[PDB]
Amino acid sequence: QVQLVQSGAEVKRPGSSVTVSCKASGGSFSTYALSWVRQAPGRGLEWMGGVIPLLTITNYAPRFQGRITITADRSTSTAYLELNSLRPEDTAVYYCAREGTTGKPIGAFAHWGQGTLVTVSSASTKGPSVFPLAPSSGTAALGCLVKDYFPEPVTVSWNSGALTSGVHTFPAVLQSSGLYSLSSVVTVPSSSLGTQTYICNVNHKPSNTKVDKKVEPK
Amino acid sequence: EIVLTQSPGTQSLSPGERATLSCRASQSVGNNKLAWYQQRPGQAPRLLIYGASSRPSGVADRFSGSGSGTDFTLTISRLEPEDFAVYYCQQYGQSLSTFGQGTKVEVKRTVAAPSVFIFPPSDEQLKSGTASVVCLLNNFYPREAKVQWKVDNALQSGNSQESVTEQDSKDSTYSLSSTLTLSKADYEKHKVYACEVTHQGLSSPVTKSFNRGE
C-alpha cells in the first residue's frame, strides 16, 4: 500500500525559508505525480505545486511561483517542499499528496501524508500559566485558562481523563504578543461542588509544562 | 484560473437525509477532471470521487458524483454520522489546479439558547499583573452567536478574543468562549464587567456581569 510520511512540525521566523519532506513507500515513486497542498486558517485547501520525479518536471501555482521549489530524490523516494520569504499568512498545515491509481494514474489525490504544521512567528518557546475559572454564583460551569504559551499545541484533560462528559476545550487564540491562550471548561452538578474534586491536567510538551490545577469555588 | 464556487458553504441536515452539494466552475473543466474530498477535523482530506463520477474502491457507494462542464454535484444518498464533515471539490482540468472553499455538512438539531457564565480573573493571575475575564456561551444551536463586552457600560473593542468548539459529537451543540484582557492596573479602574449575548434562541440579549471585588 502507498504510505506518505512527512517531517515534523516547524517554527520559522518571518523572512526565512522552510523545507518539508515527504517519504513514500509502496507503489512507484518515479512515475506518479506528487503535490503539496496547504491548509491555512480561512483558506480551506490550496494546491501549491507538484513534481513528476522521472521527468524532473514541476508545475507551480501562480500564487507561489517565485517562492517555491519542489524536488524529488528517487534514491530515497522522498519529495521536498521549500517555501521562501515566509510571512504570518504562511502559517498552515502543509500536506504532500500523491495521485491515485486504478496501475493507471487518476490525477486526483488518493494518498495523503499526515501533514506538517509550519508556524511562522517571532515568538520564543514559552510555557503557559494555568489559571482557574472558579465555579461561582442546578448546573455549574468551571474551567481552566491556559494562558501565554508558544508554540502549539497544548493538550488538556480533566481528572486524568476520567471526566469527559460536558468537557469543551476551545481552539487556541493567538494574542497580540504572538503567544497563544486557550480555555477548557466543563459543566457539573452544583451539588457536586462541595464533595467532588475537579483538576485540569495541562501538557505543553515544548516547554515541558505539565501542570495539574485543582479548580475550587472561591 | 478556474474559480470553483461551493454554495451554500454550510448545510444543516438530519442524520439519514439525502444531501446534494454543488460545485460550479467559472469556466468549463476539461475532460471532467473534477474531484471531491471529505475532511474531518484533525484529519487529512480523503478522496471520494474523481473524474466527476468515478469512485475509488473503498469509498462508500452512498457517495456519487455527477455533472459536466461547469456544473458538478456530489450526492450523499443517506447521511451516516461519520458523513458530517467538510467536502471540497477540486478541478485538475488545467495545469493550475484549484479547490472550492468547501461545504461543511453539519448536524441539524433543535434550537438551544446558550447558557452564559462569566468568570472574574483569578487571584493567582492578578498577582502576576494581568487580568483576564472569561465569558462562556455553552451548548447552543445554531452556531451563530454574538458576544460583546461592556465595562462600566462602555462597549469594548480590541481587547478580547474568542473561539468556538466543533459541533459536539453527542448533543450536536456548540460552545464559545471569549476572553477580555487588561493590565491589573486598568482592571482595577473599573467596577462592572459584563458580557452581553445575542442568539437566535434568545428573544432578547442576555447579560451576565459581576462587580469587581465582590
Binding site: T31, Y32, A33, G50, I52, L54, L55, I57, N59, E99, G103, K104, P105, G107 | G30, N31, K33, Y92, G93, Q94, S95, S97
Partner: peptide, 16 residues
C-alpha cells in the same frame, strides 16, 4: 494539461 503527463507515461511504459 500537466495532470495528464503521468497517464501518458503509463501508456508508454505499457505499449513498450
Amino acid at each position: 494539461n500537466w495532470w495528464d503527463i503521468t497517464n501518458w507515461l503509463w501508456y508508454i511504459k505499457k505499449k513498450k
